[PDB]
Design a protein around this ligand. Structure first.
Ligand code: CLA
Ligand code: CLA
Ligand code: CLA
Ligand code: CLA
Ligand code: CLA
Ligand code: CLA
Ligand code: CLA
Ligand code: CLA
Ligand SMILES: CCCCCCCCCCCCCCCCCC(=O)OC[C@H](CO[C@@H]1O[C@H](CO)[C@H](O)[C@H](O)[C@H]1O)OC(=O)CCCCCCCCCCCCCCCCC
Ligand SMILES: CC1=C(C#C/C(C)=C/C=C/C(C)=C/C=C/C=C(C)/C=C/C=C(C)/C=C/[C@@]23O[C@]2(C)C[C@@H](O)CC3(C)C)C(C)(C)C[C@H](O)C1
Ligand code: SF4
Ligand code: SF4
Lengths: 73, 659, 131, 169, 86, 225
C-alpha cells in the first residue's frame, strides 16, 4: 500500500528549517522502501535561496492540504 | 599553544572580558565571583577617577579664584606639561610667564561650589578620602574572593550524609545571584537611604554655605518653590533637599517589598513574574540582567542630559556657555551607547541564555514575540520608510523652493500636538506660580517638527536593526541554524546568494552607525537651536540652512585656530578636529576593503621579509606568523575608527563655536 | 529484523514521553527546579488548573470574599473622597503656601484607592476560588 | 481655556499673512530681486517678457497666500495638520486624495498579481489585464473593506512562512 | 580546526565531495536514502572553511554544515604557505 | 489503498495549535481576571443571523441582519488576522447595543424633562452642562446625589458584567439583566416581540440623542435643535 501521500497531491511542509515551511508543494513521488528516512518528494513553484525547486521530506514533515488558491503560497 | 598567528592578539582582546567564554571557568560560581571582583575593581577605577579630578582641581587649577567671580572667570582643568610645545616664545595657553592651563568644560566646578566646597583644603580632603575609598574597594574584592574560596573548601571538607549533597552545587553563589534580597537592599539603602543621606548633607553643608546669614537647620530648609533662584540662576538648594528627602522616603518604603533576610515577610519576584502579564523569564540570566540595567541607565542618562540643561541645578552653570552644551552632548552620547548596549545584550541573551520551548508551545513573552517577529519587523520597516520618505521629501521641497528663492512655497506644518502639550504644561506651571522655569518650554516651530520627525526616524531605524538582530539571532529564513554558531561570526559563505553580515553581532555593527547618526542629529538640533534660536526658527526648515548657517558658518574659528598668522587657545581643538577626521577616514578602509586582498598583500610582505638577507636568518615567521585581520575583527576595527572619528570630531566644534 | 527509521522514531517518541514524565517527577534534580526557578514554591501553588489560587493573595488568602469585597469598596470610597477633596473640592496648596500643614487625613486616605483596586482583584480571586 | 481656542486660527504664534509684516517684507524683497534681475536685459526682449510673467506669478502668489496663516517671526505660510477641513492650507484634502490614489495603485496591483499568479506574467505584462485592473481599482475602498470583512484579504499566519526556527525541532 | 558535520537528510549526490578543495569528504555506504550512500568528513583537520560543500549542497537546508572555529585555527585550516607550524 | 500511518509517524500540523490555545504540552495559559477567556470559536456571523433585530426597516428579516459594513464578521476575521480576539463577538455587540438603547432612551426624555422641570438644590444649567456643573459645585445635596448615581451605576455594571460575551460564550442572553419587576413579558413569543420593540425604540433614542448632541455642537446640522 501507499505509505505516504498520493502522487500529485498537495502537501503542506512542516519542517521548520525548510524554505517552504508551512507552504504547500506537490508530492512528486514517495519512496515505499521502509528504510528511507525522507521518502516523500515535494516540488514547489518558488525556488529557495539556492535556486532549488524540490526537496525530500519524511512522512511526519508533510501533511495533506488543498491546492493553493489565488494569491496563496 | 605555540602554533599561533598575529590574529591571536585580536582574538584574545575581543573577548578578554567575555568571562563566560573563559577556558577553565567551570561553573556559574566561578563566573559570578569573577564578575563580582571585576565590579569591585571597576568601582576602584571610578573612585580613582574622581580623586584625580579633585586633585587636579585643587593643585593645577583656580577654584578659589573662580568661586569669587564665577560669571566671567573660566575654570582650569589641569596644566599642560608637553615638551613638544614651543620654548622660544610663550604658548597661547600661558600668561607669557606662566604655566600653560586648560579650561574645564565638565561643570565639576559648579558641582563642587553648590555642594559646598569653599576652600582648596576641602577638595584635598576629598581627594584623599576617595583614594582611601578606592583602597577599600580593592580590599573588599580581595575579602570576597577569600570568603568564597573558604566556602568551596568547606563544601569540599564537609558533606551531607544523604546523596543529595550535590544540591549544594547550586547555592555556592547564592550571595551573588540572589535577586530578592539584592533588590530590597538596593532600592531601600542604595537609593532611598542614599537620597536621605544626601538630604542630610545638603541641610548640614550646602545650605549654610550658600546662605550668607547663619540659620539653624530646620524644616524651613525644606521648601516647594519651583524654578530657578535668580541670583545663582539655579534650582533652589532648599528644594533639591526636599526633593531628595521625598524620593528617599518613597524608596525606603518600597525597599521592604521582597523577602530578603527572612521568609516571614515580603513577596517573591518569581511569584510576581509568574502571576503577571509577562509569564516568566531567565531572571538568573546575567545577560538579561545586564540588558535591563543598561536600558534603565540609558533612560536615566537621557533624562539627566535633558534636565540638567532645562532646569539648572548647579550654581552659575547656565552662565557657562560651553559647559552646558558639553554636558548635554556627553550624556546624550552615553545614553545612546547604553541603549544600544541593552539591545545587544538582549540579543546575546537570546543567543546563549534563553531556553526556548518547543515550537508550537507559546507560554513565555519571548516565545510570543518570536511567533510574530515577522509582523514586528515589517511594521517597524513601514514606519521607518514613511518617516524617511516624508521627512526627506518635505526637506527637499523646502530646499528646492528656497534655492529658487520662494520661501512662501515651503511646506511648513505647524507642530500643533507639541504646542498643545506645551501649552497645557505652561498652564499648569502658571497655576502653580499663581498659587522661573527656563528652557523647559521653547518656541517650537515647523523646523522643530521636521527635526523631531527626523530624530523619530533615527530611533525607529536603530530599533529596527537591533530588533531584527535580536529576533533573528537564534534562527532566520536565510540561516535557520543560527543558534549553533557564536554571537559574532564572519559569514556563512558565498552560497545561498551570499551571506555577508548575517550574524546578530553584524546587526549591532549596523545599528551602531545609526545610533551615531541619530545622536548626531540630536546634538546638531540642540547645538543649532542653542547657538542661534532666531535663525534656527526662521531657517531650519530646509537642509541648506543646516549645511550653511550651522556647519560652514560656525566652522571659521576652529579652522582659523592655528595658521600662518599665528595660533590661539583653540589650536589644540583644531588639531584634534583633523586627527579625528583622519581616524574616520581610516575606519572607512576597514569598512570597505575586506580581508582577502589584505591577506594576499600580507603574504607578499611576508615573502619579502623572508627573502631579506639578514632578517630571514633570525625571523622564521613560524611564531606569530603575520596574518590579515579576520572578517569580524576588521568589521569591529573599522567600526571603532568610525565611531572614534565621528564622536571626537564634534567636541572641538562645539567648544570652538560656544567659546 | 531491521530497525527502520519509523522504528527509531517510535523509540525516540516513547523515550521522550517517559523521560519527560520522569524529569517532571521528583527523581530528577536540575538547577531549574530550585525554589525561585520554574517550579512553584513548596506549599504555595500560585496557579492551579489555569486559575489563580488563594496563595496569590499572600496573607489575604484567609480573608473571605465577602469581607474582601467590603474592604475594597470601603477603601475605594475613602480614597476617592480623599483624592477629590485634596485636589479639587478642598485644595491644600494655598494653605501650605501660606504656611499651614496639610490635612494629614487626605494623604493617608488617598493611598487607599490603589489599595482598593488590588483589594478588588483579590476579592474576585477569592470569590472565583469558592471562598 | 475655551473650546473656541481649539481651532488653529485662534493661536498666538500665528497671524494672517496679509497682515504679517515679515510676510510682506519677504515678498517685497522677492519682487525687488526679480525686478532688478529683469532690468539687466533689454526692454523688448523675450527674457523681459518672461520676467514680466514671473513678476505677475509672484504677485498672484502673494494675493493667494495672503489668506493663509503664517508665523509672526518669519511670516511664511503654514500647513494646518490638526484635522480641520474648513481651513486654508488644510492637510486633509491632499491627505484624502493621496490616500485614495495610493489605495487605487495598491489595489490594482494586488489584483493583477492575484489574477496572474505567474512569474512569466509578472515579467511579460498582460497589458489588457493590467489596464483592466488599473481601471477596476477605482472602487478599492468598498472592495477592500468587503474583502477584509469576508476574509478574502488576509490569510492565516499558519499558511505563510513564519520565519527562521528559534527552537529545537 | 573547523567542524564539518553531516545530517541524515543527505541524499548522497557527492557534490560536496566533488567541490571539496582539500579532500576532506568521502562518500560512504548507507541505507538511509535511495542512493545508498552518505558523505562523511574524516579529514576535518584539512577543512579550510570555504563552505563550497555548503554551496553545492542541494537539500532544502544543508545536509552538510561547516562550523567555523576561529579560536582553534591550525595551519591546515588557515592554508599557511610561507610559514610552517609543523 | 492507504497504509495507516502510525501515531509516531503522523505529522503534527501547526494550524492545530493556535496562539490563543495551549500548545502540545497542554499547559493552561495564564488565568484571565476580566473573564475566563475560553478557547474562542468562530460563530459571530451565525449568531448574528440567528439573532432578532432586523425587521423591514432596512428591507431585512431575521436571518438577514442589517450589517452593510459587516462589523459582526470581524470576530470571525480575527482568527485569520492574529489569532487574538481583538474584535468583539456579536453577543458583545448586542449587549452594547441594548445598553446604548436603554441609556439613550433615558437620556432623550432626560434632556426634555431637564429643559422643562427642575429639582431644588441642584445647579441650573443646560442638559449639555448639568453634569459638569454638578461636578464643579458639589455642595448641599448635589455631591451626595451624584455619588449615589455613580455608585449605583458601578455596582450594576460590576454585578452584570457581560462575562465572556466578547467571545460569545456568555451564559445569559445579551442584555438580559433579569430586571423584570412587573413580569410584563414572560412568554417566548411576547419576549421576542418585546425585544424587537425595545431594540427599535432604543435605536430611535440613540439616533435622537446623537442628533441632539450634533445639532447643539454644530448649530445648523439639525433643524429642530
Ligand atoms: C571583567 C570586566 C567587567 C567590568 C570592568 C565590569 C563592569 C561593570 N559591571 Mg559587569 N559584568 C561583566 C564583566 C565586567 N563588568 C561580565 C562578564 C558580566 C556577565 C554578563 C557582567 C554582568 C554585569 C551586570 C549584570 C551588571 C554589571 C554591572 C557592572 C558595573 C559594576 C558596578 C558599577 O560600578 O556600576 C556603576 C554604575 C552606576 C553608578 C550606574 C547605576 C545605575 C544603573 C546602572 C541603572 C539602574 C536602572 C534601573 C534598573 C531602572 C530605572 C528605572 C527608571 C528609568 C524609571 C560596571 C559597569 C552593573 C551595571 O551597572 O550595569 C550597567 C550590572 O547591572 N555587570
Ligand atoms: C544618507 C545616507 C543613507 C540613506 C539615505 C539611507 C536610507 C535608508 N536606510 Mg540607511 N544606512 C546608511 C546610510 C543611509 N541610509 C549607512 C551609512 C548605513 C550603514 C551601513 C545604513 C544602514 C542601514 C540599515 C542596516 C538599514 C537602513 C535603513 C534605511 C532606510 C530607512 C528608512 C527611510 O529613510 O526610508 C526612506 C528612504 C530614503 C530616505 C531613501 C531615499 C529615497 C528617495 C530618493 C526619496 C532607508 C532605505 C533600514 C531599512 O531598510 O528600513 C526599511 C535598515 O534596516 N540603513
Ligand atoms: C585617511 C584614510 C586612509 C588612510 C590613512 C589609509 C592608509 C593606507 N591605505 Mg588606504 N584606504 C582608505 C583610506 C585610507 N587608507 C579607504 C577609505 C579605502 C577603501 C577604498 C582604502 C583602501 C586601501 C587599499 C585597498 C590599499 C590601501 C593602502 C593603504 C596604505 C598605503 C601605504 C602607506 O601606508 O603609506 C602611507 C601611510 C599613511 C599615510 C598612514 C599614516 C602615517 C602617518 C602620517 C605617520 C605615523 C606617525 C607615527 C609613527 C604614529 C605613531 C602613533 C602611536 C604612537 C600611537 C596605508 C596604510 C594600500 C597598501 O596597504 O599598500 C601597501 C592598499 O593596498 N588603502
Ligand atoms: C505594588 C502593589 C502591591 C501589591 C499588589 C502587593 C501585594 C501583596 N503584598 Mg505587598 N508590598 C507592596 C506593594 C504591593 N504588595 C509594597 C510597596 C511594599 C513595601 C512596603 C510591600 C511589602 C510587603 C510585604 C513585606 C509583604 C507584602 C505582602 C503582600 C500580600 C498581602 C497584601 C496585604 O495584605 O495588603 C493589605 C495590607 C495593607 C494595605 C497595609 C499596608 C501598610 C504598610 C505600611 C504599607 C503601605 C505603604 C504605602 C503604600 C506607601 C507609603 C508611601 C509614603 C509616601 C507615605 C500581597 C501578595 C505579604 C505577603 O504575604 O507576602 C508573601 C508580605 O509579607 N507586601
Ligand atoms: C493625537 C492627535 C490628534 C488626533 C488623533 C486628532 C483627531 C481629530 N481632529 Mg484634531 N486636533 C489636535 C490633535 C489631534 N486631532 C490638536 C492638538 C488640536 C488643537 C489645535 C486639534 C484641534 C482640532 C479641531 C479644532 C478639529 C480637529 C478635528 C479632528 C478630526 C479630524 C478628522 C475628521 O474630520 O474626522 C471626523 C470626520 C469629519 C479628528 C477627530 C476636526 C473635526 O473633528 O472635524 C469634524 C476639528 O474640527 N482637531
Ligand atoms: C453603538 C450602538 C450600536 C451597536 C453596538 C449596534 C449593534 C448591532 N446592530 Mg445596530 N443600530 C444602531 C446602533 C448600534 N447597533 C443604531 C443607532 C441603529 C439605528 C440606525 C441601528 C440599527 C440596526 C438595525 C436595523 C440592525 C442593527 C443590527 C445590529 C447588529 C449587527 C450590526 C453590527 O455589527 O453592529 C455593530 C455596531 C457598532 C460596532 C457601532 C459602530 C459605529 C461606527 C463606528 C460609527 C458610525 C456612527 C454613525 C455615522 C451614526 C449588532 C448587534 C442588526 C441586527 O439586529 O442583527 C441581528 C440589524 O438588523 N442595528
Ligand atoms: C434604597 C435606596 C435608596 C435610599 C435609601 C435613598 C435615599 C436618598 N436618596 Mg436616593 N437614590 C437611590 C436609592 C436610594 N436613595 C438610587 C438607586 C439612586 C440612583 C438611581 C439614587 C439617586 C439619588 C440622587 C441623585 C439623590 C438621592 C437623594 C436621596 C436622599 C433624598 C431624600 C429621600 O429619599 O427622601 C436620600 C438620603 C438626594 C440627596 O442626596 O439628598 C440629600 C439626591 O440628590 N438619591
Ligand atoms: C485595568 C484595570 C482593571 C482590571 C484589570 C479590572 C479587573 C476586574 N474588575 Mg474592574 N474595575 C476597574 C478597572 C479594572 N478592573 C475600574 C476602573 C473600575 C471602576 C471603579 C472597576 C470597577 C469594577 C467593579 C464594580 C467590579 C469589577 C470587577 C472586576 C473583576 C471582574 C471583571 C469585571 O467585572 O470587569 C468589568 C468592569 C470593568 C471596569 C472592566 C474594566 C476593564 C479594563 C479597563 C481593561 C476583575 C478582577 C468585578 C468584581 O468581581 O469585583 C470584585 C466587579 O464587580 N471592576
Ligand atoms: C574616545 C571617545 C570616542 C570613541 C569611543 C569608543 C569607540 C566606540 C566603541 C566601539 C563600538 C563597539 C563596542 C563594543 C565592544 C565589544 C565588541 C566585541 O567584543 O566584539 C569584537 C569582536 C569579538 O571577536 C569575535 O568574537 C566572536 C564571538 O562573539 C568570535 O569568536 C569571532 O571569531 C571573534 O572575532 O571581534 C574582535 O575580536 C575585535 C578585535 C579587537 C582588537 C582590539 C585590540 C586592540 C586594543 C587596543 C585598545 C585598548 C583596549 C582597552 C580600552 C581602554 C578603555 C578604558
Ligand atoms: C432629537 C429631536 C427629536 C426627536 C426624536 C425621537 C424620534 C425621539 C425618540 C425617543 C424615544 C423612542 C424615547 C423612548 C423612551 C423610553 C423610555 C423613557 C422608557 C423607559 C422605561 C423604563 C424606565 C422602564 C420600563 C419597565 O419595563 C421595564 C424595563 C421592566 C418592567 O418590569 C417595569 C417597567 C414597565 C417600568 C424631534 C423632537 C423629532 C426633533 C428635534 O430636533 C429634537
Ligand atoms: S567571505 Fe566576505 S564577501 Fe564572501 S560571503 Fe563571507 S562575508 Fe560575504
Ligand atoms: S569548507 Fe571547504 S575545505 Fe572544508 S569540508 Fe567544506 S568544501 Fe571541504
Amino acid at each position: 500500500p501507499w505509505v505516504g501521500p498520493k502522487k500529485g497531491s498537495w502537501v503542506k511542509v512542516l519542517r521548520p528549517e525548510s524554505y517552504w515551511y508551512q507552504t504547500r508543494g506537490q508530492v512528486v513521488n514517495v519512496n515505499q522502501k521502509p528504510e528511507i528516512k525522507y521518502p516523500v518528494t515535494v516540488k514547489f513553484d518558488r525556488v529557495n535561496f539556492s535556486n532549488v525547486n524540490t526537496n525530500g521530506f519524511a512522512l511526519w514533515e508533510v501533511i495533506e492540504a488543498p491546492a493553493p488558491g489565488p494569491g496563496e503560497v | 599553544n605555540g602554533r599561533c598567528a598575529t590574529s591571536r592578539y585580536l582574538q584574545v582582546m575581543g573577548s578578554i572580558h567575555d568571562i563566560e567564554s573563559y577556558f577553565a571557568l567551570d561553573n556559574t560560581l566561578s563566573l559570578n565571583l569573577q564578575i563580582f571582583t571585576a565590579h569591585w575593581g571597576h568601582l576602584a577605577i571610578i573612585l580613582m577617577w574622581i580623586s584625580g579630578n579633585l586633585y587636579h582641581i585643587a593643585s593645577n587649577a583656580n577654584y578659589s579664584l573662580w568661586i569669587k567671580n564665577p560669571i566671567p572667570s573660566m575654570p582650569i582643568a589641569h596644566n599642560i606639561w608637553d615638551p613638544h610645545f614651543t620654548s622660544s616664545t610663550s604658548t597661547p595657553y600661558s600668561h607669557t610667564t606662566t604655566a600653560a592651563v586648560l579650561i574645564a568644560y565638565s561643570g565639576i566646578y559648579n558641582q563642587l561650589y553648590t555642594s559646598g566646597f569653599s576652600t582648596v583644603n576641602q577638595i584635598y580632603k576629598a581627594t584623599f578620602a576617595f583614594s582611601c575609598l578606592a583602597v577599600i574597594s580593592i580590599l573588599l574584592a580581595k575579602i570576597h574572593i577569600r570568603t568564597h574560596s573558604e566556602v568551596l573548601h568547606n563544601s569540599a571538607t564537609h558533606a551531607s550524609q544523604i546523596p543529595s549533597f550535590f544540591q549544594l552545587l547550586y547555592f555556592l553563589d547564592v550571595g551573588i545571584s540572589s535577586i530578592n534580597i539584592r533588590l530590597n537592599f538596593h532600592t531601600g539603602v542604595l537609593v532611598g537611604f542614599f537620597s536621605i543621606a544626601y538630604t542630610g548633607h545638603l541641610l548640614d553643608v550646602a545650605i549654610p554655605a550658600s546662605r550668607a546669614p547663619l540659620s539653624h537647620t530646620s524644616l524651613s530648609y525644606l521648601t516647594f518653590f519651583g524654578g530657578l533662584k535668580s541670583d545663582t540662576a539655579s534650582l533652589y538648594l532648599t528644594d533639591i533637599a526636599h526633593h531628595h528627602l521625598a524620593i528617599g522616603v518613597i524608596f525606603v518604603y518600597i525597599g521592604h517589598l521582597y523577602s530578603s533576610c527572612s521568609t516571614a515577610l515580603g513577596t517573591y519576584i518569581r511569584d510576581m513574574l509568574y502571576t503577571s502579564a509577562i509569564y516568566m523569564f531567565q531572571i538568573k540570566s546575567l545577560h538579561l540582567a545586564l540588558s535591563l540595567a543598561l536600558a534603565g541607565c540609558a533612560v536615566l542618562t537621557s533624562a539627566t542630559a535633558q534636565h540638567i540643561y532645562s532646569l539648572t541645578p548647579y550654581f552659575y552653570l547656565s552662565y557657562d556657555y560651553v559647559t552646558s552644551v558639553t554636558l548635554y552632548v556627553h550624556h546624550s552620547y552615553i545614553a545612546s551607547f547604553l541603549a544600544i548596549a541593552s539591545h545587544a545584550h538582549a540579543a546575546i541573551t537570546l543567543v546563549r541564555d534563553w531556553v526556548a520551548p518547543l515550537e508550537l508551545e507559546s507560554s513565555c513573552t519571548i516565545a510570543r514575540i518570536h511567533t510574530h517577529k515577522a509582523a514586528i519587523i515589517s511594521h517597524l520597516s513601514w514606519v521607518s520608510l514613511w518617516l524617511g520618505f516624508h521627512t526627506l521629501a518635505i526637506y527637499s521641497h523646502n530646499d528646492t523652493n528656497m534655492a529658487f528663492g520662494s520661501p512662501s512655497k515651503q511646506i511648513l506644518i505647524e507642530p500643533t500636538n507639541a504646542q498643545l502639550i506645551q501649552e497645557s504644561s505652561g498652564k499648569a506651571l502658571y497655576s502653580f506660580a499663581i498659587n522661573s522655569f527656563g528652557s523647559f518650554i521653547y518656541p517650537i516651530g515647523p523646523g522643530d517638527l521636521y527635526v523631531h520627525h527626523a530624530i523619530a526616524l533615527g530611533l525607529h531605524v536603530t530599533v529596527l536593526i537591533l530588533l531584527k538582530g535580536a529576533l533573528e539571532a537564534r534562527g532566520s529564513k536565510l540561516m535557520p541554524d543560527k543558534m549553533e554558531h557564536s554571537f559574532g561570526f564572519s559569514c556563512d559563505g558565498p552560497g545561498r546568494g551570499g551571506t555577508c553580515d548575517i550574524s546578530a553581532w553584524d546587526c549591532f555593527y549596523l545599528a551602531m552607525f545609526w545610533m551615531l547618526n541619530t545622536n548626531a542629529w540630536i546634538d546638531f538640533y540642540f547645538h543649532y537651536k542653542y547657538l542661534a534660536p532666531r535663525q534656527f526658527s526662521e531657517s531650519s526648515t530646509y537642509l541648506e540652512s543646516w549645511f550653511r548657517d550651522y556647519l560652514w558658518f560656525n566652522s571659521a574659528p576652529l579652522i582659523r585656530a592655528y595658521s600662518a598668522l599665528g595660533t590661539n587657545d583653540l589650536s589644540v581643538q583644531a588639531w584634534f578636529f583633523l586627527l579625528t577626521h583622519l581616524a574616520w577616514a581610516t575606519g572607512f578602509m576597514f569598512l570597505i576593503s575586506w580581508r582577502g586582498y589584505w591577506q594576499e598583500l600580507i603574504d607578499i610582505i611576508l615573502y619579502m621579509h623572508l627573502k631579506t638577507p639578514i632578517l630571514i636568518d633570525l625571523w622564521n615567521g613560524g611564531v606569530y606568523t603575520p596574518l590579515a585581520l579576520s572578517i569580524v575583527q576588521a568589521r569591529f576595527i573599522g567600526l571603532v575608527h568610525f565611531t572614534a572619528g565621528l564622536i571626537l570630531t564634534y567636541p572641538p566644534f562645539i567648544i570652538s563655536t560656544t567659546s | 529484523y531491521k530497525e527502520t527509521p519509523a522504528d527509531e522514531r517510535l523509540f525516540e517518541q516513547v523515550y521522550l514521553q517517559y523521560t519527560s514524565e520522569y524529569m517532571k517527577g521528583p527523581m530528577y534534580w536540575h538547577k531549574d527546579k530550585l525554589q525561585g526557578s520554574l517550579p512553584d514554591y513548596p506549599g504555595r501553588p500560585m496557579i492551579r488548573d489555569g486559575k489563580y489560587t488563594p496563595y496569590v493573595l499572600g496573607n489575604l488568602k484567609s480573608f473571605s470574599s465577602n469581607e474582601l469585597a467590603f474592604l475594597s469598596m470601603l477603601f475605594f470610597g475613602v480614597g476617592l473622597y480623599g483624592n477629590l477633596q485634596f485636589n479639587y473640592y478642598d485644595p491644600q496648596w494655598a494653605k501650605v503656601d501660606a504656611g499651614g500643614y496639610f490635612n494629614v487625613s487626605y494623604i493617608v486616605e488617598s493611598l487607599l484607592l490603589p489599595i482598593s483596586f488590588f483589594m478588588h482583584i483579590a476579592c474576585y480571586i477569592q470569590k472565583q476560588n469558592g471562598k | 481655556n475655551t473650546p473656541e481656542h481649539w481651532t488653529i486660527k485662534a493661536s498666538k504664534r500665528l497671524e494672517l499673512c496679509k497682515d504679517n509684516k515679515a510676510y510682506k517684507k519677504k515678498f517685497k524683497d522677492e519682487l525687488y530681486k526679480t525686478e532688478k534681475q529683469q532690468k539687466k536685459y533689454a526692454t523688448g526682449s523675450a527674457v523681459y517678457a518672461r520676467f514680466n510673467k514671473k513678476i505677475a506669478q509672484i504677485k498672484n502668489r502673494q494675493e493667494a497666500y495672503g489668506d493663509r496663516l503664517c508665523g509672526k517671526q518669519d511670516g511664511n505660510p503654514r500647513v494646518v495638520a490638526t484635522g480641520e477641513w474648513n481651513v486654508r492650507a488644510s492637510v486633509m484634502w491632499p491627505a484624502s486624495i493621496f490616500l485614495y490614489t495610493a489605495g487605487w495603485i495598491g489595489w490594482a496591483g494586488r489584483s493583477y498579481l492575484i489574477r496572474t499568479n505567474d512569474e512569466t506574467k509578472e515579467l511579460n505584462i498582460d497589458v489588457p489585464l493590467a489596464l483592466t485592473c488599473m481601471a477596476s481599482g477605482f472602487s478599492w475602498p468598498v472592495a477592500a473593506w468587503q474583502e477584509i470583512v469576508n476574509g478574502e484579504m488576509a490569510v492565516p499566519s499558519s499558511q505563510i512562512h513564519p520565519g527562521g526556527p528559534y527552537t529545537q525541532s | 580546526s573547523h567542524a564539518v558535520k553531516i545530517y541524515d537528510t543527505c541524499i548522497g549526490c557527492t557534490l560536496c565531495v566533488r567541490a571539496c578543495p582539500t579532500d576532506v569528504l568521502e562518500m560512504v555506504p548507507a541505507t538511509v536514502n535511495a542512493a545508498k550512500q552518505v558523505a562523511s568528513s574524516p579529514r576535518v583537520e584539512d577543512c579550510v572553511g570555504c563552505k563550497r560543500c555548503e554551496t553545492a549542497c542541494p537539500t532544502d537546508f544543508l545536509s552538510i554544515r561547516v562550523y567555523l572555529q576561529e579560536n582553534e585555527e591550525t595551519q591546515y585550516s588557515l592554508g599557511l604557505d610561507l610559514a610552517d607550524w609543523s | 489503498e492507504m497504509a495507516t500511518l502510525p501515531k509516531h509517524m503522523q505529522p503534527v500540523d501547526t494550524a492545530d495549535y493556535p496562539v490563543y490555545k495551549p500548545g502540545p504540552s497542554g499547559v493552561p495559559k495564564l488565568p484571565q481576571l476580566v473573564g475566563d477567556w475560553g478557547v474562542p470559536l468562530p460563530g459571530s456571523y451565525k449568531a448574528c443571523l440567528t439573532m432578532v433585530g432586523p425587521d423591514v426597516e432596512t428591507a431585512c428579516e431575521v436571518g438577514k441582519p442589517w450589517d452593510p459594513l459587516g462589523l459582526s464578521k470581524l470576530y470571525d476575521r480575527n482568527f485569520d488576522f492574529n489569532g487574538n480576539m481583538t474584535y468583539p463577538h456579536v453577543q458583545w455587540l448586542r449587549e452594547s447595543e441594548l445598553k446604548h438603547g436603554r441609556c439613550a432612551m433615558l437620556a432623550i426624555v432626560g434632556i426634555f424633562a431637564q429643559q422643562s422641570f427642575h429639582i431644588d438644590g441642584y445647579p441650573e444649567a443646560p442638559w449639555y452642562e448639568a453634569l459638569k456643573a454638578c461636578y464643579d459645585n458639589p455642595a448641599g445635596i448635589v455631591g451626595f446625589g451624584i455619588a449615589q448615581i455613580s455608585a449605583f451605576a458601578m455596582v450594576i455594571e460590576g454585578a452584570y458584567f457581560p462575562k465572556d460575551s466578547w467571545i460569545g460564550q456568555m451564559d445569559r442572553e445579551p442584555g438580559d439583566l433579569g430586571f423584570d419587576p412587573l413580569k410584563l413579558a414572560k412568554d417566548a413569543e411576547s419576549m421576542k416581540s418585546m425585544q424587537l420593540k425595545e431594540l427599535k425604540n432604543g435605536r430611535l433614542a440613540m439616533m435622537a440623542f446623537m442628533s441632539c448632541v450634533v445639532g447643539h455642537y454644530v448649530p445648523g446640522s439639525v433643524p429642530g435643535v
